[PDB]
């Protein structure tokens, strides 16, 4: 294992996010069933060609990583929540994640370096 992995990520809050508000919607009011809908409605259509996780990731993610269109940058373990950072560790530089949840909403990460 690498000291650190850098990684970007796609955020979809919901209502019962630990925050439910983010940089683009004042209030999160949609739904956990609603967050993961959108969720696996975005890597159907990145694995299929139809959109680019970078794109994506800029205009709808809930974390404000959105503006550098989803990066996070480098991080050790011992940082983020430990389901983003176990999946994190575990992807292939290149490779991207399904659902992964934590206590900010649920993610869909891209492992770049």
Same mark, same amino acid.
């Given at each position: 294992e690498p000291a650190r992995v850098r990684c970007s990520h796609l955020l979809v809050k919901h209502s019962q996010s630990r925050r439910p508000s983010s940089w683009r919607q004042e209030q999160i009011t949609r739904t956990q069933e609603e967050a993961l809908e959108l969720i696996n409605?975005?890597?159907?259509?990145?694995?299929?060609?139809?959109?680019?996780? %970078?794109?994506? @990731?800029?205009?709808? *993610?809930?974390? *404000?990583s959105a503006? @550098?269109?989803?990066?996070?940058? @480098?991080?050790?373990?011992?940082?983020?929540?430990?389901?983003? %950072?176990?999946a994190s560790f575990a992807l292939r530089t290149g490779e991207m994640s399904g659902p992964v949840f934590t206590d900010s909403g649920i993610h869909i990460i891209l492992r770049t370096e």
């Open positions: 409605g975005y890597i159907q259509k990145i694995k299929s060609g139809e959109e680019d996780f %970078e794109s994506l @990731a800029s205009q709808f *993610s809930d974390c *404000s503006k @550098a269109r989803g990066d996070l940058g @480098a991080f050790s373990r011992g940082q983020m929540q430990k389901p983003f %950072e176990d």
